[PDB]
């Protein structure tokens, strides 16, 4: 145990740490704690050349965690002022980026996710070899966690389950509410970049994805939001924390992440580090999570009520028109001459597919309308017989 | 609650817009710069405690092009274009070269600049938007840095200089030249030319530098309206 050093440092600090945590200002607390800390750090350095951070810090951090621990169990405001049921302040804005198929910024206190959706043709679907059987995914999710998000320098790209966890949890959360391929023909990719983080940012990407998809006009069957929960237990007594910071990790003995619509769970993750959880405790834990999740989904619905009817002008729009099948010839031409002329001027890809059906595509609506307008004056054309006012072009 | 501070000026027939405060609020400074539809999110982090052993300046600049910025799925083998290509590494060098000597003598704190392209109109190149974004993001922060930098691209068409040509005008032009500089002086020039005379090249450099000044005017207006206080950093005696 090495208790003699444990006891002496506890006597020097506990009485002053338990004072400092009552302070309402985040910054003055931090400042006062960092002073008490270094003092008894140094003061017992006087008694002997005892250890440095190697032991002191540790013996100290523990006193701190035990202090927050007892404060939370007793029934005192948590380290950030909130009680044991208040998700932090929310702000939500949509269409935040120009010329993306649909995009949103979701914010919960210090946590932010910037999320964007992109539409592909059936050709853009990912196809993959696995031992249990090869698969084709029409829904794709990517999660990026750059170092500035946590206020630190380092490698801009670093791969960890910190990201594949949050890349997979978020996908499971949204996958349940996606439209079926026969209603919505496009492949969809969503990417979430965590612009800033206080630990719990996977669930901010679920909320941001639901906004980004509605903005893009994907017909998702309902909005989906997520909450990060923790439970503190000591003897028979326990308390459940509705929305939990990246540093109150120590408080959580069981922490569970739950995501869904107003009327059912879509994904659930739980880790239980301490024995003596029972079905009764899990029942009340999820019942509190439901209250918080239903609050967030209310604020999201106020920002955007339903998915829009227009697919983003820039996103590709599959369509076809039935022009006169016999008129094929003056849209082909000798050696495909009027195909080459139409496709190069209009910058639009053109096909005749089946019995006079024309398929036409580009990035811009301008190009597509130009092409359509051009083929509607060669074929399906207003030339029945009645008199027309013509501008004289050449003589 | 979240409140963005925006200053929109004008610049060679396009209209740049600078936004702050709204996002990555935990970075030292963060700016969403956007000319026309080409938008790039640029963020600075620098650590206040200089490593006690250190004896050089560890500046790192990372420029990354997200494919969702053009509304295309990746469709590639290597980590969905995870590693930076040549096409990205060169643009990082174009940001590094004018910035690196403009930090004060004896500064040794680690600094990291990340520029991520989040939208692109195909006619307006994001590189020189990233360059004015890096200028904004350094100058908004407390970090000790010798004044803002502009950036400009000059073309040559029918014997007239053209500021910021679009990607179509560029193919008609017999010159492609980037300039970066301060109120006082040019810092960096890089160019391709179809066998122009040395006089025509310096004409381009002067013309570029004379009108990148409008970027410097607007950056200084944002800095005193929304800038963090300067670090209490002093030179090593």
Author numbering:
A (entry chain B): 238 to 632
B (entry chain A): 1 to 237
Provide the publication's sentences verbatim.
While the catalytic core performs the phosphorolytic action, the KH and S1 domains participate in RNA substrate capture and autoregulation (Wong et al., 2013) and are powerful facilitators of PNPase activity.
Structures of E. coli apo PNPase have been limited to the catalytic core and parts of the KH domains (Nurmohamed et al., 2009).
